[PDB]
Amino acid sequence: DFQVSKHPHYDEACRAFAQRHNMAKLAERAGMNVQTLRNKLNPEQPHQFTPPELWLLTDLTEDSTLVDGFLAQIHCLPCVPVNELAKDKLQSYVMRAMSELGELASGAVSDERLTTARKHNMIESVNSGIRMLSLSALALHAR
Amino acid sequence: FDFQVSKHPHYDEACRAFAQRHNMAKLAERAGMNVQTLRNKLNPEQPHQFTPPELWLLTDLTEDSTLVDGFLAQIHCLPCVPVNELAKDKLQSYVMRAMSELGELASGAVSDERLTTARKHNMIESVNSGIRMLSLSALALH
Numbered sequence: 001d002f003q004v005s006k007h008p009h010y011d012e013a014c015r016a017f018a019q020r021h022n023m024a025k026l027a028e029r030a031g032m033n034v035q036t037l038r039n040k041l042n043p044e045q046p047h048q049f050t051p052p053e054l055w056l057l058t059d060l061t062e063d064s065t066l067v068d069g070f071l072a073q074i075h076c077l078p079c080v081p082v083n084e085l086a087k088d089k090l091q092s093y094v095m096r097a098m099s100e101l102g103e104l105a106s107g108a109v110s111d112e113r114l115t116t117a118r119k120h121n122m123i124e125s126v127n128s129g130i131r132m133l134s135l136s137a138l139a140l141h142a143r
Numbered sequence: 144f145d146f147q148v149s150k151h152p153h154y155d156e157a158c159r160a161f162a163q164r165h166n167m168a169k170l171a172e173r174a175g176m177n178v179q180t181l182r183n184k185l186n187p188e189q190p191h192q193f194t195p196p197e198l199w200l201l202t203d204l205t206e207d208s209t210l211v212d213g214f215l216a217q218i219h220c221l222p223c224v225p226v227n228e229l230a231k232d233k234l235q236s237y238v239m240r241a242m243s244e245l246g247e248l249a250s251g252a253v254s255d256e257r258l259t260t261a262r263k264h265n266m267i268e269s270v271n272s273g274i275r276m277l278s279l280s281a282l283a284l285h
Binding site for chain 2: 001002003004007010015046047048049050051052054055056059060062064067070073074076077079081082084091094098099101104107108109114119122126127129130131133134135136137140141143
């Protein structure tokens with residue numbers, strides 16, 4: 001159930017993001033007036049960033065601090081960047097994601113003391129399965 | 144982790160899919176906003192955009208992370224993984240929800256007609272939901 005956090009995670013990240021970079025230099029990078037940028041980043045001011053303005057600042061600074069605070073306000077984990085190229089076919093990512101998923105189900109179906117070796121060994125299947133799914137989306141965008 | 148802005152309109156296509164997936168009149172009533180304002184902020188050709196509070200609100204009202212996922216895909220980020228309801232006892236439910244998304248992805252993976260525009264985003268939500276269910280499985284292991 002998606003819910004807004006009871007703490008100001010986003011505005012705390014807006015403040016943290018302000019400490020990490022020069023706002024005057026950043027505003028001149030983005031083409032914004034420095035006061036307009038400071039107010040949209042200031043929890044004291046009702047002005048907010050647009051979704052595209054969040055990417056551009058994220059892209060210009062290479063800093064996920066703002067995006068992580070936006071995500072934390074709805075209990076989302078911080079952004080996990082991806083850098084993937086689909087060499088094979090959409091089909092092939094679907095099938096290989098299930099050696100992972102099947103091995104994930106194999107450890108979850110028998111629930112009696114969850115191991116360290118299995119808890120570890122089921123997480124590659126998660127991480128490898130996630131990689132196959134993200135590769136499925138890119139190969140689906142191709143054709 | 145270069146957070147490059149994708150050349151594709153991931154976020155614009157997410158707004159279009161979100162606009163067709165929900166009743167705009169009821170959603171605007173629940174969100175306490177004019178239904179015209181909600182349509183304009185969902186239309187890529189309109190200049191009005193959402194605010195962080197509005198994106199949080201629409202995601203909570205609909206339990207649909209399509210807008211957040213499209214936002215994250217624009218900067219090459221994985222879809223959102225909410226830890227609000229994370230529980231160790233829900234591992235089996237996380238796993239079983241993955242085939243619903245993967246079986247849907249597999250249904251469209253094999254030869255089925257041609258290139259729609261709705262049931263391919265449809266497969267993108269299955270990838271996103273499958274990624275979220277896999278992530279919550281790894282988190283539930285603790």
